[PDB]
């Protein structure tokens, strides 16, 4: 009852963070808001300062990964917003 997802990042310059890819242990029933909070636990950035995009569509905060067909080993570029 648990999958593995990676979420590559982008080069942020106001926050001196190099582009990396965080690895997550989630479930397809987890909402995008949940997996945003699962990023909060390892780093500390609130979900209201995160943006997930799988292919070209912004991920809504009230739908599970099954809605966007997010399978295992899939990469979701995350973007921080102030």
């Amino acid at each position: 009852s648990g999958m593995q997802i990676f979420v590559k990042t982008f080069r942020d310059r106001l926050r001196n963070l190099l582009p990396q890819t965080i690895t997550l242990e989630v479930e397809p029933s987890d909402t995008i808001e949940n997996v945003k909070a699962k990023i909060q636990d390892k780093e500390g950035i609130p979900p209201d300062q995160q943006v997930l995009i799988f292919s070209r569509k912004r991920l809504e905060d009230g739908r599970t990964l099954s809605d966007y067909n997010i399978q295992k080993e899939s990469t979701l570029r995350l973007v921080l917003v102030f």
Binding site: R13, L14, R15, F82
Partner: protein, 35 residues
Amino acid sequence: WMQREVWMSVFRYLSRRELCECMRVCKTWYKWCCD
């Protein structure tokens, strides 16, 4: 929020003398220059 990382970035361009006066502006700025 939104004011920390943007204001800390404009502090890098200001010389060491300008950051000295920047602490007397506000407390939120005073806590930022000392980090």
